[PDB]
Amino acid sequence: HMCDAFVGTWKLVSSENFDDYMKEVGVGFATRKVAGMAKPNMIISVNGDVITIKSESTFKNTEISFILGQEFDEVTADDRKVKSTITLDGGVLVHVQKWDGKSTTIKRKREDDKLVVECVMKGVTSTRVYERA
Numbered sequence: 001h002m003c004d005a006f007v008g009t010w011k012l013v014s015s016e017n018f019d020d021y022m023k024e025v026g027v028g029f030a031t032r033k034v035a036g037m038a039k040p041n042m043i044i045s046v047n048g049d050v051i052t053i054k055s056e057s058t059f060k061n062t063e064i065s066f067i068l069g070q071e072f073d074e075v076t077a078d079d080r081k082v083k084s085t086i087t088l089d090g091g092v093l094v095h096v097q098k099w100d101g102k103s104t105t106i107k108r109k110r111e112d113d114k115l116v117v118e119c120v121m122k123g124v125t126s127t128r129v130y131e132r133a
Protein backbone atom coordinates (compact mmCIF):
# COMPACT_ATOMS: atom_id res chain seq x y z
CA HIS A 1 0.00 0.00 0.00
CA MET A 2 0.95 3.53 -0.75
CA CYS A 3 0.86 4.15 3.11
CA ASP A 4 4.03 1.90 3.47
CA ALA A 5 6.26 4.88 2.81
CA PHE A 6 5.31 6.24 6.22
CA VAL A 7 6.11 3.12 8.21
CA GLY A 8 9.08 3.23 10.51
CA THR A 9 10.69 5.18 13.32
CA TRP A 10 11.26 8.82 12.63
CA LYS A 11 13.21 11.16 14.89
CA LEU A 12 12.71 14.98 14.98
CA VAL A 13 15.62 16.84 13.34
CA SER A 14 14.24 20.32 12.82
CA SER A 15 11.36 22.49 13.87
CA GLU A 16 10.27 25.96 12.74
CA ASN A 17 7.63 28.23 14.24
CA PHE A 18 6.37 25.55 16.60
CA ASP A 19 6.19 27.92 19.56
CA ASP A 20 3.97 30.35 17.64
CA TYR A 21 1.84 27.49 16.37
CA MET A 22 1.44 26.27 19.91
CA LYS A 23 0.46 29.80 21.05
CA GLU A 24 -2.16 29.93 18.29
CA VAL A 25 -3.58 26.57 19.43
CA GLY A 26 -3.74 27.85 23.02
CA VAL A 27 -1.03 25.84 24.64
CA GLY A 28 0.12 27.27 28.00
CA PHE A 29 3.63 28.63 28.63
CA ALA A 30 5.01 25.67 30.66
CA THR A 31 3.88 23.07 28.18
CA ARG A 32 5.22 25.19 25.28
CA LYS A 33 8.62 25.41 26.88
CA VAL A 34 8.96 21.76 27.87
CA ALA A 35 7.38 20.37 24.69
CA GLY A 36 9.45 22.65 22.55
CA MET A 37 12.72 21.19 23.95
CA ALA A 38 11.83 17.64 23.04
CA LYS A 39 13.11 15.59 20.13
CA PRO A 40 10.26 13.12 19.79
CA ASN A 41 10.23 9.88 17.84
CA MET A 42 7.21 9.26 15.60
CA ILE A 43 6.67 5.50 15.16
CA ILE A 44 4.27 4.65 12.40
CA SER A 45 3.00 1.18 11.67
CA VAL A 46 0.16 -0.45 9.77
CA ASN A 47 -1.74 -3.66 10.49
CA GLY A 48 -4.50 -4.33 8.08
CA ASP A 49 -6.66 -1.16 7.86
CA VAL A 50 -5.41 0.10 11.19
CA ILE A 51 -2.62 2.71 11.28
CA THR A 52 -0.86 3.38 14.56
CA ILE A 53 1.22 6.52 15.20
CA LYS A 54 3.16 6.63 18.42
CA SER A 55 5.03 9.67 19.73
CA GLU A 56 7.75 8.88 22.26
CA SER A 57 9.64 11.55 24.07
CA THR A 58 11.01 12.75 27.36
CA PHE A 59 7.79 14.79 27.71
CA LYS A 60 5.02 12.39 26.91
CA ASN A 61 4.40 9.03 25.24
CA THR A 62 1.21 9.16 23.14
CA GLU A 63 -0.33 6.69 20.72
CA ILE A 64 -3.19 6.88 18.28
CA SER A 65 -4.67 4.01 16.23
CA PHE A 66 -7.19 4.73 13.50
CA ILE A 67 -8.76 3.78 10.23
CA LEU A 68 -8.55 6.36 7.42
CA GLY A 69 -11.76 8.46 7.15
CA GLN A 70 -13.14 7.26 10.52
CA GLU A 71 -13.35 9.81 13.33
CA PHE A 72 -11.89 9.02 16.74
CA ASP A 73 -11.26 10.57 20.10
CA GLU A 74 -7.76 11.77 20.80
CA VAL A 75 -6.13 13.25 23.87
CA THR A 76 -3.31 15.43 22.60
CA ALA A 77 0.14 15.86 24.10
CA ASP A 78 -1.07 19.26 25.45
CA ASP A 79 -4.06 17.47 27.10
CA ARG A 80 -6.83 18.82 24.75
CA LYS A 81 -9.70 16.25 24.21
CA VAL A 82 -10.30 16.45 20.51
CA LYS A 83 -12.17 14.63 17.77
CA SER A 84 -9.83 13.61 15.01
CA THR A 85 -10.11 12.36 11.46
CA ILE A 86 -7.19 11.20 9.36
CA THR A 87 -7.41 10.69 5.62
CA LEU A 88 -4.96 10.11 2.80
CA ASP A 89 -5.20 12.85 0.13
CA GLY A 90 -2.82 12.68 -2.76
CA GLY A 91 -0.21 10.77 -0.77
CA VAL A 92 -0.39 13.03 2.26
CA LEU A 93 -1.79 11.94 5.61
CA VAL A 94 -4.16 14.77 6.62
CA HIS A 95 -5.07 14.88 10.31
CA VAL A 96 -7.83 17.23 11.43
CA GLN A 97 -8.39 17.85 15.16
CA LYS A 98 -11.65 19.53 16.19
CA TRP A 99 -12.50 20.94 19.64
CA ASP A 100 -14.59 23.80 20.99
CA GLY A 101 -15.52 25.16 17.59
CA LYS A 102 -11.81 25.27 16.58
CA SER A 103 -9.78 23.13 14.17
CA THR A 104 -6.08 22.43 13.43
CA THR A 105 -4.65 20.37 10.60
CA ILE A 106 -1.44 18.30 10.66
CA LYS A 107 -0.18 17.09 7.28
CA ARG A 108 2.44 14.32 7.18
CA LYS A 109 4.29 14.02 3.82
CA ARG A 110 7.18 11.82 2.71
CA GLU A 111 9.75 13.94 0.92
CA ASP A 112 13.14 12.49 -0.03
CA ASP A 113 14.21 10.45 3.11
CA LYS A 114 12.20 12.71 5.43
CA LEU A 115 8.83 12.90 6.97
CA VAL A 116 7.77 16.60 6.66
CA VAL A 117 5.01 17.61 9.05
CA GLU A 118 3.09 20.80 8.54
CA CYS A 119 0.89 22.04 11.34
CA VAL A 120 -1.60 24.78 10.65
CA MET A 121 -3.80 26.75 13.10
CA LYS A 122 -5.58 29.73 11.44
CA GLY A 123 -2.84 31.74 9.79
CA VAL A 124 0.08 30.14 11.62
CA THR A 125 2.13 27.27 10.14
CA SER A 126 4.86 25.21 11.73
CA THR A 127 7.03 22.73 9.89
CA ARG A 128 8.70 19.83 11.65
CA VAL A 129 11.09 17.48 9.84
CA TYR A 130 11.76 13.90 10.98
CA GLU A 131 14.36 11.45 9.66
CA ARG A 132 14.69 7.64 10.04
CA ALA A 133 16.14 6.76 13.42
Ligand SMILES: COCC1(c2nc(C3CCCC3)c(C)c(-c3ccc(F)cc3)c2-c2nnn[nH]2)CCCC1
Pocket residue numbers: 021022025027035036038039040041042055056057058059060076077078104106117119128
Ligand atom coordinates in the same frame (compact mmCIF):
# COMPACT_ATOMS: atom_id res chain seq x y z
C1 LIG B 1 -1.22 19.28 16.61
O1 LIG B 1 -0.24 18.22 16.82
C2 LIG B 1 1.09 18.60 16.34
C3 LIG B 1 2.25 17.68 16.74
C4 LIG B 1 2.41 17.89 18.23
N1 LIG B 1 1.58 18.73 18.89
C5 LIG B 1 1.74 19.05 20.21
C6 LIG B 1 0.67 19.93 20.80
C7 LIG B 1 1.07 21.32 20.77
C8 LIG B 1 0.27 21.87 19.64
C9 LIG B 1 -1.04 21.18 19.79
C10 LIG B 1 -0.70 19.78 20.18
C11 LIG B 1 2.79 18.54 20.97
C12 LIG B 1 3.01 18.94 22.42
C13 LIG B 1 3.70 17.66 20.31
C14 LIG B 1 4.79 17.13 21.06
C15 LIG B 1 4.72 15.93 21.73
C16 LIG B 1 5.80 15.47 22.49
C17 LIG B 1 6.95 16.22 22.59
F1 LIG B 1 7.99 15.70 23.34
C18 LIG B 1 7.05 17.44 21.91
C19 LIG B 1 5.97 17.92 21.15
C20 LIG B 1 3.49 17.30 18.98
C21 LIG B 1 4.50 16.35 18.42
N2 LIG B 1 4.23 15.01 18.56
N3 LIG B 1 5.29 14.40 17.96
N4 LIG B 1 6.16 15.34 17.52
N5 LIG B 1 5.66 16.57 17.83
C22 LIG B 1 3.46 18.16 15.97
C23 LIG B 1 3.58 17.31 14.76
C24 LIG B 1 3.07 15.97 15.21
C25 LIG B 1 2.02 16.26 16.29
